[PDB]
Amino acid sequence: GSSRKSKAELQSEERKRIDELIESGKEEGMKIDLIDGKGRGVIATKQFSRGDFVVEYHGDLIEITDAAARAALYAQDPSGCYMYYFQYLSKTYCVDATRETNRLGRLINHSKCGNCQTKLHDIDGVPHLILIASRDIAAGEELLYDYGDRSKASIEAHPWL
């Protein structure tokens, strides 16, 4: 197999890698830390390249089916027990991350000026919410993403608006 691996082949391999990490729940390259002037967050312990899978946002998947419940989701503010939500294949889902686990995605802080972005990842039709590096990230940096990145698109599509 000496032929140069395609950009497509690499993405296919990374999809397979991600499926397995999501299956295993193995998490490498991050730790909880205490940050001076902020408190608890999650930091990189190794380098991440722009576009690298960072962590799954792991918790309990809940499907939401009525307009009122959707409004309740959409009207949320990033600041506690914020329930991250998304649209997938004409369904609405949120992830309840309130159970205490060892899975670290739930502990990554919110920022409008972050270094990670969310992405949906399909495993046999089941959407998984993962975090991806928006740029090169150094060991030692706090991981941050925008909790509100999907709100505007969700709100605009709501039947009551």
Residue numbers in the entry: 189 to 267, 269 to 350
What's the publication's text?
Protein lysine methyltransferases (PKMTs) comprise a subfamily of posttranslational modifying enzymes that transfer a methyl group from the cofactor S-adenosyl-L-methionine (SAM). SETD8 (SET8/Pr-SET7/KMT5A) is the sole PKMT annotated for monomethylation of histone H4 lysine 20 (H4K20me) and many nonhistone targets such as the tumor suppressor p53 and the p53-stabilizing factor Numb. Disruption of endogenous SETD8 leads to cell cycle arrest and chromatin decondensation, consistent with essential roles for SETD8 in transcriptional regulation and DNA damage response. Here we solved four distinct crystal structures of SETD8 in alternative ligand-binding states with covalent SETD8 inhibitors and native ligands.
Strikingly, BC-SAM and APO differ from TC by their distinct SET-I motifs in the context of the otherwise similar SET-domain. Furthermore, the post-SET motif of APO structurally resembles an intermediate state between BC-Inh1 and BC-Inh2 but is distinct from those of BC-SAM and TC. In contrast to the structurally diverse SET-I (I1-3) and post-SET motifs (P1-4) in these structures, their pre-SET motifs show only slightly altered configuration. The differences between these structures highlight the conformational plasticity of the SET-I and post-SET motifs. The BC-SAM, BC-Inh1, BC-Inh2, APO, and TC structures can be readily classified into three distinct SET-I configurations (I1-3) and four distinct post-SET configurations (P1-4). Interconversions between metastable conformers cover a broad spatio-temporal scale in particular associated with motions of SETD8’s SET-I and post-SET motifs. In the apo landscape, the general structural features of the X-ray structures of BC-Inh1, BC-Inh2, APO, BC-SAM and TC are recapitulated by a subset of macrostates (e.g. A6 for BC-Inh1; A10 for BC-Inh2; A12 for APO; A20 for BC-SAM; A22, A24 for TC, 6 of 24 macrostates, Figure 11).
